[PDB]
């Protein structure tokens, strides 16, 4: 539907049925993103962390 | 606005006016993602399929 | 929450507190995408512009 999150990848992996296909998944611990697709997930390619200006 | 989908890329290509710029596009057949932008689309870089745990 | 936008990267960089972590950020001028994460942003890897069919 939109975007949800999990503490980490393993939490995401065990809750495949709680996420509808085509939804974005944020991993709080690693600040990474995955997408729930048919029969699994796919990792979104993200760049290096851009620190917030002072 | 958010996220929509098409069966495949060609269906997406012929419906450019049905998707507002800045929207995410899921291709059901290839489980790929595109983003509708100014004057076209851009393919989102996704990783290999991560199979669901047994 | 979902998706928002800025004219360009610099406008985005000065408004870090206007975007909640886990939100997608579209840059109108460069038609690029970033994601607001913990302590900053991360650039989404996008492909070359796919022109709209005539």
């Amino acid at each position: 539907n939109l975007v949800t999150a999990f503490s980490n990848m393993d939490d995401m992996l065990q809750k495949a049925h709680l996420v509808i296909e085509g939804t974005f998944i944020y991993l709080r611990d690693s600040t990474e993103f995955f997408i729930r697709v048919r029969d699994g997930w796919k990792k979104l390619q993200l760049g290096e962390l851009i620190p917030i200006p002072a």
Side-chain angles (χ1 to χ4, degrees), chain A:
Chain A
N1 300 300
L2 16 59
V3 49
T4 183
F6 293 98
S7 292
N8 45 237
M9 189 184 294
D10 288 303
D11 192 50
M12 172 189 87
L13 293 175
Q14 60 186 187
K15 296 175 172 57
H17 300 308
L18 293 184
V19 189
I20 301 294
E21 158 175 41
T23 297
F24 284 98
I25 304 177
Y26 178 56
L27 301 191
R28 299 193 299 272
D29 285 46
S30 58
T31 69
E32 295 186 303
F33 252 97
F34 281 85
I35 54 162
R36 224 307 206 175
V37 302
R38 180 182 56 194
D39 305 311
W41 310 258
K42 282 185 172 181
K43 186 171 189 174
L44 228 83
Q45 301 281 59
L46 298 177
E48 215 71 352
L49 176 66
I50 303 170
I52 298 180

